Amino acid sequence: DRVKRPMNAFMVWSRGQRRKMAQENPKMHNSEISKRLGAEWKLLSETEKRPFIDEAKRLRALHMKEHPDYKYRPRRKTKTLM
Amino acid sequence: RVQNTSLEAIVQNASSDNQGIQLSAVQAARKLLSSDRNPPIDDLIKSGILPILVHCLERDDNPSLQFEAAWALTNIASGTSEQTQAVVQSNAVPLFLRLLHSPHQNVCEQAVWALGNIIGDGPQCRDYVISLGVVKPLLSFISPSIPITFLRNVTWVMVNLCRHKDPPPPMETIQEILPALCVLIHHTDVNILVDTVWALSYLTDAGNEQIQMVIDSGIVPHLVPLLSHQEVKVQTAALRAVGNIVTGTDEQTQVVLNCDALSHFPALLTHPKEKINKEAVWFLSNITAGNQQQVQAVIDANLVPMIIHLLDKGDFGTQKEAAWAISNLTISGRKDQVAYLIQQNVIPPFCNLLTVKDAQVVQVVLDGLSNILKMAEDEAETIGNLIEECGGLEKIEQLQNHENEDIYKLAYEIIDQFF
C-alpha cells in the first residue's frame, strides 16, 4: 500500500487513521495496518468519504495548476478566428 | 458589429431559397462569431439560426455553405457549456461526422474543429461523440500526406478525447488512440509533439488502469527520452506525463525505471528553471516512496547527493519536495539505505527545515527524523549527537510548544525516547 502524491481520497483518509492506529496498537505491523485501513475504507458512506474526496480533488487541481507550463497547456475549446 | 446589423435579417436570409442570399447570411453570421474573442453567441442562438446552420451542413451541393456553417457552429460550440450543449441538442454532431468524409479539405478540417470543441466540453459530450464513431475517421487523417496545420488540429482533438477523468474515456477508445500517439510522438513539429505528450499526460493522470493501457501500448520507451528533449516545453510535458506514471503501482513505477528515466535527472536537477527542479524532485519523491529496490535505484543513479544538495540552499518549493523525498526514503529504505543517506550529510539540511512555517513540512521532517532514530537502534546515540551538533535538537525542543497537535505530540515523544 503506497502513498504517492497527489493523494487520492483513500490516501488522505489513511494518513490520519494510520497515526492513530499505530499509537492505539503499537504491537501491530505496518502491513497489517494498511490491510485493515483498506478494508475499513469500504464501510464508509458517501457522506463520510466526501471530505476526503473533496480534498483529493483539491490536491489534484493544485497539482495541475502547478504544472511548469500550465499557461501553455492545450485548451478544451478554441475559436476559428479571422 | 452586432449593434449595427439586423440579426433577424441574417437569420431570415439564411433560410432563403436563393443560394447567394443564403451564403451571404451564413457568412455574416460567421464573421459576427469570429471577429474577436468575445463574440455574440447568445444573441445568434436566441435568433434561431442554429437549425439553419445545421441544415446547411447537409448541403453537399454547396461546399462553401457547409464550410461557412461549420465555421459558425465551431465558434458557437467554443463558448460555455450551455452554448456547446445548444449545438449538441441541434443534432449537429452526426452531420459533422458525415462531413469528415467530405472530399473538400476545408469542410473536413472545420468539421474536425467543431467536433473538438464539443468533445472538450466534458465526459458526457466526449463519450457521445465517441459512441457515434469519431475516433476511426479522425485517426485516418493521420498520414504523411496530411497538411501540417490540419494535423495540429487533429492532435488537439485527440487531446480532448483523453482529457476528463470522471469517467475516463472508454478503454477501447484509449487503445485506439495510443498507436496514433506512438506515430505522433516522433514528429518534428513542436506543436504536435507537445500536444501528443499532453495527451499522454492526461491518460496517465486518469488512473492506474489507464496508466497500464499507456504501458501496454509500448509508448513509454518513447516518452522517457523526451525528458532530455531540446525544447523545454516538450521536457516539462514529458516530465509530468512520466511523473503521473510513477504515481501508480510499484510495477508501473518500475517500467519507467527500466527505461533509464533516472539518467535524465542529473540535468533536470541542475536545470536553471526552478519549477523544473521542483517537478523533478516531486517525481523522485514518488520513487523513494516505493519499494526498497526503487530506493536503491535512486541511490545507484547518484541522485541522493543532488537531492540533498537541492534540499540545502534550494528554493522553498523544491526544498519541500526534497523533504518529502527524504522522509519517504526513511519509510521505505533499509537500514543501510538510510545509513548511506546519513553518510552524505543529510542531517544538517534536513533539520534546517524544522524552522519552516509550513506545518506539513515540519510534520514530514519530524516523521523522517523519528524513523531515522528508530532505524539505527545501536547507533541512536550517535545520530542524536549529530542532530544536536547542527542545532537540530534545539529546533525539536522549540517545536515541543508548536501549535499543531501532531507536531508537539511527536516532538515530546521523540525527545522522550532518544533525548
Residue numbers in the entry:
A (entry chain B): 39 to 120
B (entry chain A): 67 to 485
What does the report in the manuscript say about this coordinate set?
Humans harbor seven IMPα isoforms (IMPα1–7), each containing an N-terminal IMPβ-binding domain (residues 1–70) and a C-terminal NLS-binding domain constructed from ten armadillo (ARM) repeats (residues 70–500).
To better understand the mechanisms of how critical signaling regions in SOX proteins interact with nuclear import receptors to drive nuclear transport, we crystallized the HMG domain of SOX2 (comprising residues 39–127) in complex with different IMPα isoforms. However, we found instead that, SOX2 residues Arg40, Lys42, and Arg43 were bound at the minor site (IMPα3 ARM domains 6–8) and that SOX2 Arg57 was bound at ARM 9, outside of the minor site. Overall, this structure showed that, these two distally positioned NLSs within the HMG domain form a contiguous NLS interface on IMPα3 through ARM domains 1–9. The IMPα3:SOX2 interface was mediated through a buried surface area of 2034 Å2, 14 salt bridges, and 34 hydrogen bonds. In contrast, the ARM 7 domain of IMPα3 is set back by 4 Å, and so provides a favorable interaction with the HMG domain. Here we found that IMPα3 bound SOX2 with the strongest affinity, with a KD of 102 ± 15 nM (mean + SD, n = 3), whereas IMPα1, and α5 bound with significantly lower affinity with a KD of 447 ± 27 nM (P < 0.0001) and 247 ± 30 nM (P = 0.0017), respectively.
